[PDB]
Chain A
Amino acid sequence: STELTVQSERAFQKQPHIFTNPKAKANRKTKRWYKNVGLGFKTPKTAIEGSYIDKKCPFTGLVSIRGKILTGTVVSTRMHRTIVIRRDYLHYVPKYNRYEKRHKNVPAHVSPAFRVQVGDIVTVGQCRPISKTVRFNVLKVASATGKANKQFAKF
């Protein structure tokens, strides 16, 4: 959601302490620094190839993945650069010896590496507090398509 403009604030944004040397003459110009996050998560090429900055990106920024690694389907993609994961689960109650279907949401930051839509299953790593509620950061959109290419029925 949103994206595209690159350098488009009142300020103008670079990867901090990282340098695009004007004396030196490379083809890339912008020396794209990137992070390997680990835990058996690949750096998506969208992150390394592209252009966007983000402090709050875990691959092109200063946020570091650590602690818990959740997953979950995405409910809302409406806000800018963050997603609302919805982490369904069961709560036991011993008096009856059955379960509930319980809710909890997780507002997590999404790096423009990934395209995230509504109803996409998303793996998400814990990190620094990014904002008020955003303490989580998306690392792997599992449902890349989810029947996107194969929508039409006719032969």
Chain B
Amino acid sequence: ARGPKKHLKRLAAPHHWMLDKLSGCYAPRPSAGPHKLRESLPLIVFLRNRLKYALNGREVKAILMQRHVKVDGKVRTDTTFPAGFMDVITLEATNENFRLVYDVKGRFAVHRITDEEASYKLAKVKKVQLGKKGIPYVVTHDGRTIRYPDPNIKVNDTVKVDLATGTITDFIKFDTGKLVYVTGGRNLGRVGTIVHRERHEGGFDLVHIKDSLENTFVTRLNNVFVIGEPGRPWISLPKGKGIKLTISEERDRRRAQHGL
């Protein structure tokens, strides 16, 4: 209506915040950034509801101002900066380096990553075009645009970005039997190998993907992110490791593991 909408109501807020239904009218609208509103995570939600390093919004703001937070090398001061999938949040006091990675259920898991790994960022490939002055450039689904990529870096590949410099360390070619991580819908957060690629002219390229448990599932190509070669992922994944157990199994795990 009449131009860009500026608020986000707390029910309309995306579920993988894991916000309270109650406790205020609104939720933080993640501002214009390198990630899509619903597939993002603002710095309020991270430092208040997940980590609980700030008891409230004001506290979070204060922390931001203090400038111990750094989402992907640069500093940030905006409460509602959309830090999305693969973004590396480093709090310099604590030295609690994090990478924003999904849990098997779907929500963003707080992955307490080491200092040596929290340095690069793995990122997908959205486009490969040439800009002005005839220079080829790659675009990432995770924000950045990098000039001059190795000619054999094509669409839907993944790219290890040095992050500090904002360059290209290395890449993985998207292909059959190469470790992949899922970022869309019912399979969001799982991890698998890649078996097929149903081509389909226009209407969404599907991908048959099996996990470590030999459990198959299918997703669209845009909802899949190439994380390594089977056995060696390029990033440390959280406990569970994109398996996603059955409900019964989960229950069993819960009520077997009673260690007071």
Contacts and interface: CB of A to CB of B under 8 A. Distances in A.
Interface of A: 38-40, 66-67
5 contacts: A38-B201, A39-B201, A39-B202, A40-B201, A67-B202
A66 B202 contact: yes
B199 to A, nearest CB: 11
Interface of B: 201-202
Contacts, number: 6
Closest 6 CB pairs of A and B: A39-B201, A66-B202, A38-B201, A40-B201, A39-B202, A67-B202
A38 B202 CA distance: 10
Nearest to B201: A39
A40 B202 CA distance: 12
Contacts of B202: 39, 66-67
Nearest to A40: B201
Contacts of A39: 201-202
Contacts of B201: 38-40
Contacts of A38: 201
A49 to B, nearest CB: 26
A39 B203 CA distance: 11
A38 B201 CA distance: 9
A113 B201 CA distance: 24
A67 B203 CA distance: 8
A35 to B, nearest CB: 16
B202 to A, nearest CB: 7
A40 B201 CA distance: 9
A67 B202 CA distance: 8
A111 B4 CA distance: 42
Contacts of A67: 202
A39 B202 CA distance: 8
Contacts of A66: 202
B200 to A, nearest CB: 10
A66 B202 CA distance: 8
Nearest to A67: B202
Nearest to A41: B201
B64 to A, nearest CB: 44
